[model samples]
Target: GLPEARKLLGLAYPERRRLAAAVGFLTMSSVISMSAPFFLGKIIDVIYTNPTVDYSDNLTRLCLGLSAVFLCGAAANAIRVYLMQTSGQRIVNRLRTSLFSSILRQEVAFFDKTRTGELINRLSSDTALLGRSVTENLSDGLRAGAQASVGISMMFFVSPNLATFVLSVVPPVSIIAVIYGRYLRKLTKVTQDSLAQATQLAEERIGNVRTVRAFGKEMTEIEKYASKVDHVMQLARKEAFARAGFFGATGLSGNLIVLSVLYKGGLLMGSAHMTVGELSSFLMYAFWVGISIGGLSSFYSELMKGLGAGGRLWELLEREPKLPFNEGVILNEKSFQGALEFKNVHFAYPARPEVPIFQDFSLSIPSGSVTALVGPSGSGKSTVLSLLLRLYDPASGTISLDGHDIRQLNPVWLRSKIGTVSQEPILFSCSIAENIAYGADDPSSVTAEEIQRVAEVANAVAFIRNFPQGFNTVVGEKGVLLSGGQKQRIAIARALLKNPKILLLDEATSALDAENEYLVQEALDRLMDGRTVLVIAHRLSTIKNANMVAVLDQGKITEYGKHEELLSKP
Candidate 1:
């Protein structure tokens, strides 16, 4: 994990400097706060031996100093937490963004083999867990370690005799912590896994809530979720028990060592080898060091959990995108004249290359014309529009716009010139006005008059204005508020508003009844004038008015001519 992460980080080394600064600020605050304990120990020793000395003035000064220390520490702590938390979020954001970009670029085949929900889990929950390690765990663990070291060293300074005796028992306590920490790491990992499963369950259920509720599978979904949660509870219980036992064992060991130190030191004190102040300071420092180091056992467990999370996160970052565009590919929009052509294009889906869909298939539609493709089921008529849209590039051969290779054009800009209306037209969760003006870069470029004209032409204005909020009405998720016919008309209005150079209608009228179909077709006919359009239809009624209709059979164009000419063939 570390090696692969390092390799990935090679490209992102610059960002680590920001991370390091965040860590530094956090560590500085912890060390400064820890210094208070050492000062308190000294104050206690000073008071223990000189009770008669007039120390009120000094005590007041010390209290003021301590107050100031606390005030400063509080400010620093706030800054540290804010910086670290913000930086952690930053790292997670960068990772997710990079991952999403890569996934978009990956070959189309990669998405086919993986579930969308699984990918979402890896991107969200996994990155969040990884962030805890960077911001929360690393700072605490480093500060605890450094303070413990210095505190233990100070013990030897106060009284070497007692410090050495206390030091003798450190190895055994450390050994127990190491052993227990390993088990705790294993248990915590199980808990995290169970939680991820529970998350996945929620994600799946919510994404398919309609189907689940309709089928009365609510109880079954609950039971399935409960099973995963039950496992999570068991794993959490084990983690709690292990942590309790580890701290219990460490505390017991620390107590025994303190007893050993006192017993051995009493003999030394009796021989006049150590003064009371010296002995008191030594014991205080020893306790501080023992507690600090012992606390590291829990920190170690957290660190291991963090490392596991980081491994998952870095794996996502290291992954290359599926379909990265070539460097410096530029789209020249002015060059596209909307002459859509498919030349000897052969494609079988990556999943089933042997079952060819288009074999030496070729078609050339002149600019500014409407061509309707009619075919039986599985005839690959729709595949033509998908290829032209460049959603999935052809498995072989070339598709071009005005004889310019599509691969050479910028994907984002190339898509901007084309508009499509599918049978199941998707309306985003936005206002009716916004949906109608979807592709308009600047709303000012599309006047309100033009928007209403398109909507009216598509026969959507009557129903839209009748709604309570009119154009400002929010389309519910999946446009549930609108009928199928209404949704299709709104989609058509949206494309018409774009006034794209090329329009694709994939069974676009199939969703509408006869009345709505006629209205939308009239609007589409106006929209397609002097624009290149490719229409795929299963309904013979939709093709009766086509300027030219091509009948396809199993991917080949078997018959082609004007609508009436094709009708005369039978």
Candidate 2:
């Protein structure tokens, strides 16, 4: 807990200068306000003792001077608040951006074990909780501590007897507050965990609402969400009880302390050792001390809550991705060729190791040849593209490009040199031009002419021009508004803009009507030209023109030949 608290402060170190300025203003305001009680006591004394001597003009001058000082205090308080709030927002912005970058850099398999909703929860609320913990809450805590110490010091200076007698009540209340803070810290952790689970459920359900609707399980999902929230409410009830009980006791103690000061100070005034003005000042300072102590209690409680949330944030910040993100050697462009070979591969997905996707599998895809890979639906056809892209390493095998093992080449560079269009090509919800431009190394620098040329090459231009806004029209989420063929052609145009030396297609024309398929197939033929290609063929026409055809089953290539050679052999 202490280490996490220290790290939480580390997040604030970047804005140290600004926070220091805010703290300075806090000090200025606290000191000015604390001096008011003594001056007020003096004014009371002057009024009661010098009733015969008239000095209304002098009194007016003093009152106006104090008013001006108070105005300065108000200004300082305002600046301090503004500084604290802006600094908190700045820190939160950095945390979210940095965390998001780290998330993107992590290995793809890490995502297999984690949930998108949970990560989003971390990005939104967890970052928020930790940011507030270290910024505004810390500022308030610091002010409470400094004001409490100074007020206690002033109490002793005004009247040590009253301060000492009244101070007896401080330790027990401080101890109680410490207990409540610790409890609330642990309690906040449980509440936050419950909320994250609830958030994950909601995000997943909403993202896949179609499946829920198809199954008619809306009521079950609603009940599941209700149960999750019910747990959070239970934790909140406990939190509220502790908060209510602690504040109620503190309120009582604050009142009793003020009353105790009055009784003791009156006794001292009667004995002639304490002046009326001095007793009055001491009693007011005593009242301030109680309020300051309550503030201190709030500071500790918030600090503990911060520590709890900070612990979770620290886990993500410190996690080292198992796979290298940007660590391999770049291949020489003059020597690199598109030839790919997979030799005796053995593999399984990390999430389901017992169910192997490939075992002792092997294939050779010659450079500048279209190799049609025909396989059953459950076979490792799609996994071939995954392996070629180095999304995950094989358990044991050598996947090489132009005689160089892919593991030794930069994965990012390897991916950049290859283009892929999956069975269900996913297009983001953006303008048609922007979606195509994403294929370029720099999307912003891509010109409209290049986008139009690629669209024309992929046979997507005529229909795109038919749309109301042409290339500027927005595609709805996941390209849902477009027909299957429209999305496929746009994907082809995107891949064409990439202009990679190697291409992988997963049954690109399988789902469209024959007319739409013909248009998409023409684009596929153009995309495959002058490039090494591996097409998972679901249609007979897709296999007929290939230089070689391979049949895959039971985790290995069972047959390999020219299309007519296999048919003639039987």
Candidate 3:
């Protein structure tokens, strides 16, 4: 917790100016708000001790001056709130972008294990809680401390002897603060983590509501969500128990001090020569001291909550991505041929290490040749495409492109030069033209005319024009509104826009109707022309038309040349 809190504070380095301003106002307001009682006594003493008509003049002027001080308090609070709120968001803004970058840079295997919802929760929920601590909570804590300090000083000025005695509450309360802060912070982490899982469950269910609907499992899923949150409630109860116990003791201590102060005040006033104005203001100051103590606890506990949420944020901020994010060699475009080779590339998915998906698998494809990998389902066929995309590296052996190892190439650069599509290609829910434009090196630089040309070549122009909005019409999430062929061709136009040197079709044509497939197939041919293409062969013609065919089995030992359905046997 201490280490994480240190990192959390480091994020505030940029907010130094705002922090200084807020702290200045914190003390200013603390002074303004706390001195009301002190000034109040002056007003009381003025009226009581003076009987002259001119005394009324003193009262009016004092009241007027005090009202202005109160106005200054208002000014300070507004300025402080504005500065802290904006600075906190700046910290939050910086935190989210860097965290998002880290998350994206992580290896695919990490994503395979960590759900999207959990990541989203950390970025949003946890960061927000931590930000408030850095800004509002931290300010409140200091303001309360300042109030307590000044209040105690005023108490001592009028009643120094008893004020020293009431200070006895300090050490025990300090111990309680230390113990409760640590406990609450640790408790806050687990509670927040449990809440993230609950969010994950809900996120997962909502994203695939169609599947749940298809299976008529809405009520069943609702029950699971409720069950997840029930555990959250239980974790929350534990947090509440500690807070209740700690604050209950704090409340009792505060009240007990007041009780003692009252008895002590009575004795001192009656026998020790204390004046009425002094006793009245002393009572006001003592009560505020108690109130300030309670505020300190609230600030302390909320800081613990921030520290708890900061735990994962620090983890994300510091966790180095296992794979290279954007570093490696680059190849000259003219000499950078798409001659792909897999020499003894053996592998297993990190998620399923027990089963070796590729054992001594090998394939070779010269530039401009289409090689179709023909294999039964689950025979590491699609795994080949994933490797090509470098989504995951092989456990052993090299996957080289041209003479250079693909591992040696900058992954971002390499991926930029290779274009591929899947049977289930994902399109964002944007207008069709913008989706097409996304494949360019810079989406902003692409023009409508170029988008239309690609759409026409992909045979997507006809249906797009029929729409009222044409290419400007928005697609559904993942193109659910468009039929299979329409989505594929829009995807086809995207890859066409890229015009890469290599293409890997992962059963990209498997889901289309014959009429749709023919249209998509023709558009795909244009996409494949002059590019090094590897088709995860599914249909008969797709395999027969390949320049070379390879079969993958349980243990991949594909001897590539040409063999069709006959080669698919185990």
Candidate 4:
């Protein structure tokens, strides 16, 4: 637990010297702050001991000295907080970057089993909590410890008997808080998960609002979101009750300790064993001790929550990704010919292992030939592409490229050789040229001449050049600003720029009008001229020119022949 709590500090190593300076300032601030009570005690003695003496000058000097101490403490506190918060920001920035990189490093299957909203929530809120715990809470805890130590020592010097009684009650309050903090940690974990679920629900619904509105389920969605929020509220309410109870008990115990000190110290003062000034100082020190103990109790729970968040982050960082790219040989394009085969492959998604999607699924695509796969929606057509991409591995048997098993190849290098343009192509929020040039070996190094060449080959330059910015036009989020045909053309241009050995067209022209479809298909036809092309199409008419056509039904190739042969039979 100690090591886990300290892990965030390692992230701030670049700012360690500043962090050390912040700690020093904080220590000085706490020492100066503790002097206020001592000076007040002296002022009380001056007033009480010499009732007939002129004490205006003495009181003024004491008050000025106390004011100076407070001013210095305030300056120290401001500097310490500024430094700590700066280091905290840097730490959180590093943490978010590392977490996002780890997420990208994971296999596609991990994404299939996880929610984007949940991961985003952890990256944002959880990391922020951990930052505060490491810096602000840590600073408070240190200050509290220093104040408690100095206050308790001063109380004992003033009245040993009273200090013993007051200090004795404090330990039980702290012990009870420690035990209660454990329960709160569990509750906090549940609350955080519940919040994440609600966030996930909202993210999915809002991202697909067009579909929701088209289905006329706006009111229904509102009710569903309301229900999720209500569930989160219920969990929050339970947590609140537990929090209130913990704080209520600690607050009562703190007050009780203060009252006990007053009662006992008053008696000691009456017996001449303690002066009015000493008793006054003892009461102030007891107040400081109580406040410090109560603050520490709260800080303890915050630390637990921080550690829990850190633990989740650590799990993600340490877990080995199933499809890591660090191993395997890098393929040289010149050494390999483009050929693909799936031999006796069997597969099922982990989420639905009982429902097999492929069994002994075998196919072969000769080098430099067009092969089309036509099937109904759920007949494993898209799964073929997924497996070929090695996004998900087959349960058994082998998928090979250029006569070598693809599993033995570096996933990144393997993917670099294949180009895909899906039915709905996704583009980043950048210039049109950037989206097209994204497939180049180095996007930054891709010249304007190369971008224009592919755009011309994809037949996209006519419409693209019509825009004021030409290739530099911003595409908006996911290319939402572009028409279906325009985005698809850009996708084709991107794939063409890659000059890949294999081309995958998954219903590339399915969503476009006849005019756009013909234009896009013409470009695709030119693009597929010399590549090993695999086309997954639902429309049977599009495969007329395919060298061979394979029909899949329920994960098996039910028919295999040229378009004329298969059409002639059925």
Candidate 5:
């Protein structure tokens, strides 16, 4: 556990020297803070021993000294808290940003295997736990340790023999805390994992509530989720119970240590081995020492909790991106001529390398031609679309655009020149106008007027106009408020606004009815006028007029060419 904590600490502070300096300052503040009780005990012992008259003068002087000590203690605590909080926030901020950036760079395949809820949990709850550990847990532990040290020193000054006698209790209490902390962190992690699972289940169920209700499996799902929640609750209770037992035992043992110290010191004073003031001060110091030890137990527990949080956070940060950008890939926008070719490209998912999805796949897509790919669901037709978009690289071949390897071209630049509309269109939960302008980052690409023109062409303008606020009307999450056909048309309008040189229509028009298909197809035809278009078609009618059609079967291109040429084939 300590090693894991250290590992996370190292990652959070890449510059060890600077982190060391901050920790040193914080440690010093903790030490200075200990002077509070020490000085108070000394003043009490002095006043009791001397018994000087002029009570008013001594009281005035003592109060003044105490005010100064209080002010210094306040300053030290402030500095320590500030440093710890700053360090913790910095770590969490960096971790969150890095996690987001890493996830963005990951391949679509990774997202396919992981649930969104798990990712969201890491982004929010885990990072917050890490922050608490960094700020509160770290500072409190150091302060507790420093207090214990000073309290012990004061005890030795008042009654050296008694201080030595009471030393036996410290180790047993520390051992109890260590044992509890080990189990406590484990249970905490279990609780966190269970919560993440429950969140994922809830998100999955809610997102597809329509399907769950249709299947009449709501009760089954409810039972499953209830069991998971119960497990989470049990783990949480276990953590609490273990932590409570540790502190409770430590407190009991601490009381016994103080009681023994008082008993022995009293005897010593009665036997003329110590003075009354010495014994009184010794008893006060013993009580402070025991309280400090109890505080150390609390601090240890907090540190362990923080370490657990850090471990979870570190696990997320350590995940390698499924897809990494190649440093050698460099291509200027002017250098591309839009010609695309697949040179014997073959690929299988990493998990199924023995079962190839596409074997010896080869094709050439001429610039400014409308081509379509059609086949059965498992015939790798969609794989061709994914390959064309370069979402996943082929294992055994190369893809080139205008005689340059696509792998050597920057994906961002390539994607910038491309537009896509999937079978099920998705829109941001924003105004209709903003959704229409989704991918048009450059003003030269398209303007608001152009977006309106495209929307009008796509046949979405009529319904949008029916809304009270027209284009400014808010679309609910993923455009759930819109009909499927309306969403598709709006997506087509967004693609039109991109003004892309290449367009990918992955069953983009399948959602529209016969009446709406013609309307949206006309807009699509207008958008495809001068661009290279690739359509993944579900129905035969959609791509019969394409410049060329490629028919795939079992991951191989079974047929290719114009409609007339294919019809004339034996």
Candidate 6:
């Protein structure tokens, strides 16, 4: 199993050089900054031992050294920040790219079982949190660890009695933080989940804005969204209360330690046990240690939050795509003869495993023939097309293309050999030409002339040319800007452009007006020639010219013959 994301900070191997340099600078800066307290102690001793005039030179030099120390610290911190951010962003980009590719490699069934909004949230927000885990939190922890260690050691050297008193409070503060932080961690996870749910709701509503408007549910949606946000706010309030309690207890403990040290140091000075300069220096070192401890506490809390987020992203990255897209053998031969067969298939959706879709089902589609499947809704007509395209494999038995089991072929390569258009065609938010060109195996390699040719053949060129931008026109999400027939024809143009060996059409003109349906049907008729076509149609009249019509019912074909012959039988 892959390492948990929080433990995978070593993934910064690519930026090790920069990170090493940053660490070197940070160490140097910490050492120089610590020297200032010692100089202040010396300045105090010089003034006490010598007259004002005699101590002037020494004090002036000490003050100048202090100024230089802080200037160097500032410069070192700036460079360190730059290096860390650059390295962090690079890691984020790489992780996002890998996660997205993994999602694309998954089988269609995986998508059926996952929500689009949740996946997107994981890809984006979760990855970003992981980046901060490795960068900002890691850096703060390292810097604070170094400063705290050095500061405590210096305090011991300067005043052992005071250092011991300061260390006394550490245990109790740690106990308080640990006790409260556990609940905060749980609350943080709840907060993250609630926010993700809210995001999912928003994404779904915006993506289906037309449906929301059609039903006049705008205020209803707003109220629902407000409820989700309120849930998140409640979790956030709990987190805040817990966090404040922890910090408040730690703050009181730190201040009490400081007061105890002050009283103890005054007694030691009165007895000539420590000089004024030495006491001042010890106090400064104690302050550094206090700040370092508090910072580490906050860093621990942030690290926990980041680990929660990272764990979610790692779940996705570690998942093996069920399809095995990269491992399967690419079919050595191209140009399948277009013969298709499903043999004794037993299948059920993964989401509804007990509800069988097919049992001992079989079908054959001969090469260069148009086979139309006619049936009422949910009679497994579209399921047949889905199986032929290998969107989901049968639970038992095989689907073959040109006598080769499709499972044996590389999934990506197999999909490239087929063209599909459904009842509601999906179009990206891009230009018409680009959408049509996306049908090509390598979309970037498609030529403008090829796009224009396919559009003309699909009978979409006339209306397209009438638009102000013609082929350059941008279609909104899912082609909402286009009429039903226009979108369908554009989809046909895309399929025609691919010129696949087999074509699958699922109610290509089912939702259009009569005039638009006739126009789309004419274009589809031209596009279907010389290919193996499997069509699912609700209207019985549309399949009259089909070479064969199969009547599917109860998971089996009850009638199979030429369309006229099947009709003549009754």
The window of 10 residues in a row where model 6 has the poorest summed lDDT is 1-10
lDDT of 2 by residue, 374-482 (tens): 8775348898988899899999989999989998888888888899988788888989999999888788999999999999999999999999899988896855388
- Residue 353 local lDDT, model 6: 88
Q: Note the Cα lDDT for every prediction shown.
A: 0.75, 0.86, 0.84, 0.84, 0.75, 0.83
Query: Where does model 3 exceed 4 Å of error?
Result: 1-9, 50-55, 164-260, 476-480, 508-510, 564-570
Q: What is the lDDT of residue 75 in candidate 6?
A: 85
Model 4: clashing residue pairs? none
Model 3, range 1-570, lDDT digits (tens) per residue?
Answer: 566767766878899899899889888777767767877777677677776647666668978987898788788889988999999999989888988988888888899888899999999898898888888888888877888888889889988877886777666766877887788889889999999999998999899999999999999999998998999999999999988887887788767767877777788878955767787888898778878888998998998888878877878777887778899998887888889998898888887899888888878789989988876664478788788878899888889988888888889999998998778878898898889998998988998899999999999999999999998888969553988888889989999999899998877544668788888889988898999998888778878888888778775754567655546654
lDDT of 3 at 233: 95
Candidate No. with top lDDT: 2
Looking at model 2, residue 355 earns an lDDT score of 86
| Least accurate 10 contiguous residues by lDDT in model 5 | 11-20
Model 5 earns a TM-score of 0.77
Cα misplacement distance, residue 208 of candidate 4 (Å): 15
How well does candidate 6 match the true structure in TM-score terms? 0.84
The whole-model C-alpha lDDT of candidate 3 against the native structure comes to 0.84
How does model 1 fare in lDDT?
A: 0.75
Tens digits of per-residue lDDT for model 5 on 1-570?
A: 667767656655653454455567667765665555555556666767667655788789979977997787677667655766677777778778977877777787887777899888888877777766655665566666776787789788767788888776667766866887787788888889999999999999989999999999999999999999998888888888877887787688768766777788788978988866666666666666667777877877766766766666666666776555443465567866677888888898765668888888888888998888877763376677677667888988988888888777777766767788777777778888888877686644656688789888788899888998888888968543987777878988888777788888877434567777777677777877889888887667757878898877777778999878988995
In model 4, how large is the Cα lDDT of residue 448? Answer: 94
Q: Where does candidate 5 stray beyond 4 Å?
A: 1-54, 68-72, 75-80, 113-115, 125-136, 169-254, 291-335, 351-355, 441-447, 468-470, 474-480, 508-510, 514-518, 564-570
Q: Which residue runs of candidate 6 sit more than 4 Å off their true CA positions? A: 1-10, 54-71, 173-254, 326-335, 478-480, 508-510, 568-570
TM-score top scorer: 6
Query: In model 6, which residue pairs have backbone atoms overlapping below 3 Å?
Result: none
Ten consecutive residues with minimal summed lDDT in candidate 3?
561-570
Span of 10 residues, lowest total lDDT, candidate 1: 5-14
Alpha carbon deviation, residue 429, candidate 5 (Å): 3.1
